[PDB]
From Swiss-Prot:
Being totally regio- and stereoselective, this enzyme is of interest for biocatalytic purposes to produce chiral scaffolds that are of synthetic value in the preparation of more complex functionalized chiral molecules such as natural products and analogs. 2-oxoglutarate binds at R299. This is L-lysine 3-hydroxylase. Binds 1 Fe(2+) ion per subunit. Alpha-ketoglutarate-dependent dioxygenase that in vitro catalyzes the regio- and stereoselective hydroxylation of L-lysine, leading to (3S)-3-hydroxy-L-lysine. Can also use (5R)-5-hydroxy-L-lysine as substrate, but neither D-lysine nor L-ornithine. Belongs to the clavaminate synthase family. GO terms for molecular function: 2-oxoglutarate-dependent dioxygenase activity; iron ion binding. Keywords: Dioxygenase, Iron, Metal-binding, Oxidoreductase. InterPro entries: Clavaminate_syn-like, TauD-like_sf.
Length: 329
């Protein structure tokens, strides 16, 4: 029954939540139609947040031994929440007061970014159940478990962080988290060395494909390792559906990672007023089966992405643009 610990939990006091609510009034631009102005206003207004909150976010952003995630509780209550949309085309979360609270916290950590090939390049995406993709390996699934993965395993432009703010929760929908440090603690020396070898080719996610769309990096990339970086602070790239072992031992090692994940993963049921930051280099994430009703009261998260460095994607964006063009993913 492992859950996110006190070190990986930031609880806002009533006073801190009130400051955050007032500071959100400094963020006035349209999140979808003036994304850069919106994000830059949030980055500047974030200087007005409580110092204790800013300190925890900057520590998490630095990354060194950060646990892989940070759960924030006590965000100001979403009071006039519209019904949960049945698809992600409406971008309902992007005009809620939560989008401003989420942007302020995000912009303490790093620069918000979006991807043309992911949820229409929306600054905030509605993470809601899809009746079509219910049995699919996507953030809109429900009837099947969302398998352990890092976000955009195939892409060098993958986000540094995934930001999930909860508008409506579902009691059966558990978010699973598993860090590269937790993984390495269960493995033998030989398994760690092998995961550090470039033995996995990676393929572009099927949802990124489109008629007449060509990727500069091609459809199949690598081979790449699963583990990299410092021995005591390893980075992870993992996705069974998009990473193919170049040999039978390479395929067996992904099974080793999956078993360690089922044995050691921590869980948390996201509730309204909560926000989860996942370090996409240090942890993998998943989600349990749940049973949505598609009745306007379903689980509803606002998803956004963060990168430490916006210059890394400049070649893939327009001037004062926050959207990475699909061909560069």
């Amino acid at each position: 029954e492992s859950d996110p610990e006190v070190s990986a939990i930031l609880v806002l006091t009533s006073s801190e939540a009130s400051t955050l609510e007032r500071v959100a009034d400094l963020v006035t631009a349209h999140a979808l139609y003036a994304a850069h102005d919106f994000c830059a206003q949030a980055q500047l207004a974030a200087a007005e947040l409580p110092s204790r909150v800013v300190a925890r976010l900057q520590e998490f952003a630095w990354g060194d031994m950060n646990e892989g995630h940070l759960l924030i509780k006590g965000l100001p209550q979403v009071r006039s929440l519209p019904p949960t949309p049945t698809s992600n085309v409406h971008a309902v979360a992007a005009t809620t007061p939560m989008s401003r609270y989420q942007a302020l916290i995000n912009e303490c950590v790093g620069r918000m970014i979006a991807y043309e090939a992911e949820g229409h390049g929306h600054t905030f995406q509605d993470m809601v159940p899809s009746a079509m993709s219910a049995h699919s390996q996507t953030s809109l699934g429900s009837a099947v478990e969302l398998e352990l993965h890092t976000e955009q395993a195939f892409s060098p432009l993958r986000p540094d962080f995934v930001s999930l703010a909860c508008l409506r929760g579902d009691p059966r929908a558990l978010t699973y988290l598993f860090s590269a440090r937790q993984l390495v603690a269960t493995l033998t020396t030989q398994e760690i060395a092998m995961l550090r070898e470039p033995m996995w080719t990676t393929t572009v996610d099927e949802s990124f494909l489109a008629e007449g769309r060509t990727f500069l990096l091609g459809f199949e990339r690598g081979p790449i390792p699963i583990l990299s970086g410092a021995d005591d602070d390893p980075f992870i790239v993992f996705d069974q559906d998009l990473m193919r072992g170049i040999s039978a031992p390479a395929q067996e090692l992904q099974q080793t990672v999956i078993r360690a994940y089922y044995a050691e993963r921590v869980s948390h049921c996201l509730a309204p007023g909560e926000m989860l930051l996942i370090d996409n280099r240090r942890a993998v994430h998943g989600r349990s089966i749940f049973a949505p009703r598609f009745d306007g009261a379903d689980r509803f998260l606002s998803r956004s992405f963060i990168v430490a460095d916006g210059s890394r994607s400049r070649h893939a964006r327009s001037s004062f643009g926050r959207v990475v063009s699909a061909r560069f993913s």
